[PDB]
Amino acid sequence: GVTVSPEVLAHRPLIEKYGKEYGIEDYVSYILAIMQVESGGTAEDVMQSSESLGLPPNSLSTEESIKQGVKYFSELLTSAEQQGVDIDSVIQSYNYGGGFLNYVRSHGKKYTYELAEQFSKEKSGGQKADYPNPIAIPVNGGWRYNYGNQFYVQLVSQYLTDTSPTEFDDETVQVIMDEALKYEGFPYVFGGASPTTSFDCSGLIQWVYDKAGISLPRVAQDQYDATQEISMEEAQAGDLIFFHSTYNAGTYVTHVAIYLEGNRFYHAGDPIGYGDLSSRYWQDHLIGARRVIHN
Secondary structure: OOOOOOHOOOOHHHHHHHHHHOOOOOHHHHHHHHHHHOOHHHHHHHHOOOOHOOOOOOOOOOHHHHHHHHHHHHHHHHHHHHHOOHHHHHHHHHHHHOOHHHHOOOOOOOOHHHHHHHHHHOOHHHHHHEEOOOOOOOHHOEEEEOOOOOOOOHHHHOOOOOOOOOOOOOOOOHHHHHHHHHHHOEEEOOOOOOOOOOOOOOHHHHHHHHHHOOOOOOOHOOOOOOOOEEEEEEEOOOOEEEEEEOOOOOOOOOOOEEEEEEEEEEOOOOOOEEEEEOHHHHHHEEEEEEEEEOO
């Protein structure tokens, strides 16, 4: 998740210009990551987009290069959308050409390094070249097929930074669960938010997250509103899982639990302990996972 060079960030206003023009201002981080890999903001053909236009290498000015680079990336996005293939296939197609999208589509519709490698093997006629790149050395000794770059997605991914809310580290998860397990076996108490009174689902969350140094609201619906939506596949230990029609609370959100992993959760159910998401009752009442915002 390396931030790009200042000479790449210097081209950012021009990037956002053709970004909004080709309706892909959302993907400006990918254009910066591609530019860092292609030239480092050093070359005049800063996107190395001359070839995509049928021109010999470095035939475009800095402005020409950014316009065509963004245009070509948006055409690849569009073709990928039609074919039902993912963003890493788009990134690889900037390097390999649009034919890589059709290749991935016919082989499971998801980018894999093995697909990038086999596409290069075929297009190069099996010709290999030494590649003294620290990304390549631990993978195959440091070589590549003489067609594009089979490591292109790994190179471009180095300069992509995930700024989305980060999950709790292992130490904080242990602080949360050490506190939560002190009340294991305790009875469910509607309106309870202390060991003295015992707890309700949201009262357990508020008390346990406070001991971990996290301030959260008191009501499940408020805790839902104060946290950010995440897919079940990206959910981690310490994230919260919310449920809808478990009882008449007068709000959409009625139930909340501490997510652990897989189908496991901890919550003030009756008695206070662990539950299984995979169960018919919880699967039918499941809203989804939400993340507590912290650094």
